[PDB]
Amino acid sequence: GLTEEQRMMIRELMDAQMKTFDTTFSHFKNFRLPGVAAKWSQVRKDLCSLKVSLQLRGEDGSVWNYKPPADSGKEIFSLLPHMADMSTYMFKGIISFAKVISYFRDLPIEDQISLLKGAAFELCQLRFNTVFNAETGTWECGRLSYCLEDTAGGFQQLLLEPMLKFHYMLKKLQLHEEEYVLMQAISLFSPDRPGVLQHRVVDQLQEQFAITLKSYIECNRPQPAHRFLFLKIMAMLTELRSINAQHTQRLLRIQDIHPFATPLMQEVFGISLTERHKILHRLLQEGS
Amino acid sequence: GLTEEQRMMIRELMDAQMKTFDTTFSHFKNFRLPGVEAAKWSQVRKDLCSLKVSLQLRGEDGSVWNYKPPADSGGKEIFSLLPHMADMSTYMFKGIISFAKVISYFRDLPIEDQISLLKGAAFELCQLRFNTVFNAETGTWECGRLSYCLEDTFQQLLLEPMLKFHYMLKKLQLHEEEYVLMQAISLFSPDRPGVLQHRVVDQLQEQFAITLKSYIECNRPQPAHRFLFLKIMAMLTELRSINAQHTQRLLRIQDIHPFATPLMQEVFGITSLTERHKILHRLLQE
Ligand SMILES: CCC[C@H](CC)Oc1ccc(C(=O)OC)cc1NC(=O)c1nnn(-c2cc(OC)ccc2OC)c1C
Ligand SMILES: CCC[C@H](CC)Oc1ccc(C(=O)OC)cc1NC(=O)c1nnn(-c2cc(OC)ccc2OC)c1C
């Protein structure tokens, strides 16, 4: 059903995903852990929305479990250094993912920086959804797991958070690996990211990935449960871009109050294009 | 009531306990934590499995770290909590050494008898202090910010003599004065290995036991507590048996997997009485 170029396009994306996604997080080490005016009132309401407990299962069978403090002053920033290290590690895998794709490495190094800069959060969330357990509200990251804390309204209150609603909605679609990796490609090759110069070239690339996704779905999903699935996916990607803008502003408000971002994260935000992104520029020039 | 010599005897023991028992464990810091020949090994596995506890660490901000031990998979995994317990035992024993140094009857003994008594009573006095922070309802030793909770495997727990001791002793609901008198009777044991002033230590132990017996007769409703003193003495006899069983237990583990601190090494037979106990000798002369 798929064309030969579309089959090869899916094969390269799937191969890149396998080579660059550490699903067991076995190489995630040396991370930080919680030790053994209205800007504050605005910041406090953001962190509590996505409260998680941290669990670490050792290779021997032991389990360390961290329950966060129940308050809202600097105790709300206890897990941010760890989540920053976790986010940075996921982003380095995202950078490697883009470097393996032939359509990406042929772009100018400044556009490669701009595309990764604008899609860092989005591709991280797409990979996070593949390890999200919707029944337990837990992201299962190999030895580490992040379990959402219960609340009064239960499922109702937590779903008001658009980031959590995105993960539950996307998980309900029961996407295949091929559909996830095509979403990552469509988000990565966004022609309207700030700083992009080859707008038309990136725009032509994005359209071919979307056409391939539509063709893949029509060849492998006949059930009425998957009606309009391609348009649902494209709608989810538009929603994810909106969530990216809102959560980037949350982080900068928190970085204002309590600095926590890693040097690579600081490059992604605001905290010569190659001069302001020395780490990303180096990682893009290195091999894999 | 008590005689004047017996009332002052209890006052000195309570004074020593107050000054040397960190009941909140506020000064227990910088301890190690679990990170993130087959015949001798076969016995060691059966040794550690009986007393498995989860470690809970409460932070000043309200957060809680909890450690669940791994199940026996046949390796060095069953040694995960030994560095931490070695640090806890070392900290408790330094408080036990300071407790004995406050007692006038103990300072008047030769330094070699002081070493032998503390060496033989180290485990016993530590368990006696541990029982005062043991919550029998939850099976947890509450050590300030630290908690050690017995892992569910109750009738089966009572097969282990160490756990049966803490449940039975806690059920007696002893006073602070009765606990510290138990510590004195255990500390002044004349039949410890290496003791030379047998007659002097025996007479001291008898005076403490008579003081405890007289304290119970005067401060508790008779005849309801008619046999409480004999129950306490029976608990002390069982504790001496548990001490010998777990000393041999530690030696077997230390042989295949060294974990004991330098002060612990002096407590057991790990390598003149003062020459083989230079740390203990130093802590006693300071
Ligand atoms: C494995 C966890 C999955 C779950 C999915 C929602 O995630 C969390 C759960 C809980 C918390 C939390 O309890 O907070 C203390 C925070 C996050 N999530 C980020 O911490 C985070 N996710 N993405 N990014 C990010 C990364 C960037 O490039 C490196 C750029 C911008 C970013 O965000 C604006 C961050 C900091
Ligand atoms: C802190 C909670 C109290 C609880 C009471 C049973 O304690 C444990 C809980 C759990 C374990 C455990 O899960 O095992 C890895 C082990 C012990 N208990 C000792 O670790 C231990 N208690 N006393 N001593 C010791 C000390 C000596 O000098 C003071 C001399 C000899 C000793 O033993 C032969 C040790 C090593």
From Swiss-Prot, chain A:
Q: Does the keyword 4Fe-4S apply?
A: no
| Example GO biological process | negative regulation of DNA-templated transcription
| Binding-site list for hyperforin | 87, 125-128, 247
- Descriptive protein name: Nuclear receptor subfamily 1 group I member 2
Family to which the UniProt record says this protein belongs: Belongs to the nuclear hormone receptor family. NR1 subfamily.
* Gene name as annotated: NR1I2
Tell me where in or outside the cell this protein is found.
Nucleus
Any idea which UniProt keywords this protein has?
Activator, DNA-binding, Metal-binding, Nucleus, Receptor, Transcription, Transcription regulation, Zinc, Zinc-finger
Molecular function terms, GO-annotated: DNA-binding transcription activator activity, RNA polymerase II-specific; DNA-binding transcription factor activity, RNA polymerase II-specific; nuclear receptor activity; nuclear receptor binding; RNA polymerase II cis-regulatory region sequence-specific DNA binding; RNA polymerase II transcription regulatory region sequence-specific DNA binding; sequence-specific double-stranded DNA binding; zinc ion binding
Does Nucleus show up as a keyword for this record? yes
In which tissues or organs does this protein occur?
Answer: Expressed in liver, colon and small intestine.
